[PDB]
Amino acid sequence: PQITLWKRPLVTIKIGGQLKEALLDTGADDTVLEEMNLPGRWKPKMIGGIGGFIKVRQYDQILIEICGHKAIGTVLVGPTPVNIIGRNLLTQIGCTLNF
Amino acid sequence: PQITLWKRPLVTIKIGGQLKEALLDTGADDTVLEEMNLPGRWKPKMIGGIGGFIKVRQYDQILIEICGHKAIGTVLVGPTPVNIIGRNLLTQIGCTLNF
Numbered sequence: 001p002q003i004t005l006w007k008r009p010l011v012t013i014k015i016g017g018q019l020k021e022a023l024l025d026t027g028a029d030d031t032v033l034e035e036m037n038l039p040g041r042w043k044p045k046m047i048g049g050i051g052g053f054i055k056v057r058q059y060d061q062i063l064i065e066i067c068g069h070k071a072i073g074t075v076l077v078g079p080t081p082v083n084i085i086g087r088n089l090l091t092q093i094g095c096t097l098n099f
Numbered sequence: 100p101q102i103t104l105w106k107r108p109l110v111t112i113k114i115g116g117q118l119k120e121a122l123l124d125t126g127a128d129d130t131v132l133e134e135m136n137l138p139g140r141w142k143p144k145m146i147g148g149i150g151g152f153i154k155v156r157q158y159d160q161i162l163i164e165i166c167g168h169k170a171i172g173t174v175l176v177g178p179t180p181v182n183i184i185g186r187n188l189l190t191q192i193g194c195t196l197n198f
């Protein structure tokens with residue numbers, strides 16, 4: 001799909017058997033999801049944005065189905081206000097910006 | 100132009116006679132620029148992100164030429180880690196997401 005930007009670019013995702021809504025975010029290098037129990041081994045990490053930093057659990061090789069398009073990669077889990085699909089996964093589903 | 104996301108979608112903007120680079124950010128509702136000298140009256144405002152909130156100076160009806168495309172709209176100036184072009188201006192230059 002082609003998505004205009006008059007509204008937030010929210011898509012439906014499937015991760016860990018759970019269904020969520022997530023913002024397709026070209027301003028995010030990596031994917032950040034609100035707290036969830038994601039199976040696997042994880043390493044602590046810190047990430048920063050507007051307003052400061054949050055502590056997240058770094059998970060590698062996580063399967064996510066983004067708008068029906070499958071991708072595997074690093075997924076950060078922590079206290080983000082919103083689920084964010086970052087460029088690490090946008091590249092796998094072939095997402096481009098167009099103007 | 101069509102832009103892949105293997106690298107940050109950074110573009111050159113011209114605002115207030117000054118040249119800057121700014122991130123095309125579909126996850127940002129609003130445009131927020133690193134500290135800069137913008138002529139005009141401005142209103143105090145607070146905006147939130149991953150780490151919390153920052154105080155910014157709000158400038159309305161500001162002209163920006165983003166990658167050679169002209170847009171006029173609100174520009175927030177404050178302690179952002181990176182210059183971000185948000186949806187309020189991306190819609191004006193016809194930016195879309197495509198996958």
Ligand SMILES: CCC(CC)CN(C[C@@H](O)[C@H](Cc1cc(F)cc(F)c1)NC(=O)O[C@H]1CO[C@H]2OCC[C@H]21)S(=O)(=O)c1ccc([C@@H](C)O)cc1
Binds near residue numbers: 029081124126128
């Ligand atoms: C400038 C910040 C940006 C470049 C440094 C990085 N960020 C992405 C932005 O797209 C962000 C998305 C966002 C949307 C929300 F609705 C809520 C929220 F908390 C975050 N937008 C944002 O802060 O926008 C501001 C301005 O507009 C407003 O609307 C939206 C909120 C307000 S990040 O998320 O911090 C982030 C993502 C990933 C990493 C690692 C994994 O790489 C680090 C950091």
